[PDB]
Amino acid sequence: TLSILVAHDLQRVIGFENQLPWHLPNDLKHVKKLSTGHTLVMGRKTFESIGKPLPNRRNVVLTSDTSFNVEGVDVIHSIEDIYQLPGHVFIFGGQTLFEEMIDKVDDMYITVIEGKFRGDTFFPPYTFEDWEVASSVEGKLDEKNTIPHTFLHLIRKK
Numbered sequence: 001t002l003s004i005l006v007a008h009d010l011q012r013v014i015g016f017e018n019q020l021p022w023h024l025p026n027d028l029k030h031v032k033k034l035s036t037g038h039t040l041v042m043g044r045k046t047f048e049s050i051g052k053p054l055p056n057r058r059n060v061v062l063t064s065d066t067s068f069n070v071e072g073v074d075v076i077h078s079i080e081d082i083y084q085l086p087g088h089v090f091i092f093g094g095q096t097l098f099e100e101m102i103d104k105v106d107d108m109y110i111t112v113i114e115g116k117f118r119g120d121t122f123f124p125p126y127t128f129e130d131w132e133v134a135s136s137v138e139g140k141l142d143e144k145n146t147i148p149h150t151f152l153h154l155i156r157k158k
């Protein structure tokens with residue numbers, strides 16, 4: 001089973017200068033709950049962004065660098081390797097990977113950040129004609145989590 005996992009804002013910004021443009025603890029917890037015990041797949045730049053692999057799940061990095069050999073990371077070198085990985089695989093980032101996968105994945109777990117940020121990376125446009133809302137749940141706001149946001153689970157129609 002193959003899912004996208006992503007947070008994008010009202011204009012589908014996902015990234016600025018190789019970071020997330022927002023501080024949102026609730027979203028990162030969301031990620032941890034979903035992906036813990038399973039597999040992440042991510043592109044090189046995204047890994048450099050997180051910098052080490054996430055504990056307690058199988059971290060996998062897509063890169064062309066056949067020199068790449070990082071402790072605690074599986075490495076793959078084509079897209080087509082993804083379909084070999086067993087279990088629940090999450091496509092984790094970033095823009096290049098989403099672009100390449102969005103047409104391929106079963107479903108997407110999207111956090112809509114209900115704001116407009118400055119970005120330099122974007123999620124590809126998509127249509128609800130194509131995507132059934134299996135659930136939609138407002139994140140809770142609070143002293144520490146102050147941007148409105150919604151957890152969407154979308155499943156490919158038809």
Ligand SMILES: NC(=O)C1=CN([C@@H]2O[C@H](COP(=O)(O)OP(=O)(O)OC[C@H]3O[C@@H](n4cnc5c(N)ncnc54)[C@H](OP(=O)(O)O)[C@@H]3O)[C@@H](O)[C@H]2O)C=CC1
Pocket residue numbers: 005006007008013014015016017018019020042043044045046047049062063064065077078079092093094095096097098100121
């Ligand atoms: N808000 C969110 O949900 C998330 C946002 N982001 C944001 O996304 C942005 C990063 O996206 P982007 O810059 O596109 O980088 P990516 O994280 O998608 O990594 C791009 C790299 O992945 C490798 N790669 C991708 N496709 C292939 C392929 N088909 N075959 C071999 N290697 C491949 C290449 O690495 P190499 O050069 O080593 O060959 C490529 O340069 C950042 O701004 C980050 O903050 C990232 C994750 C989540």
Ligand SMILES: COc1cc(Cc2cnc(N)nc2N)c2c(c1OC)O[C@H](C1CC1)C=C2
Pocket residue numbers: 005006007018019020027028031046049050054091092093111
């Ligand atoms: C691009 O930056 C990140 C992307 C991501 C990826 C990511 C973040 N948020 C959402 N909703 N989907 C994603 N695929 C993460 C992330 C990032 O910054 C360190 O951090 C956290 C924990 C501390 C490591 C988790 C994920």
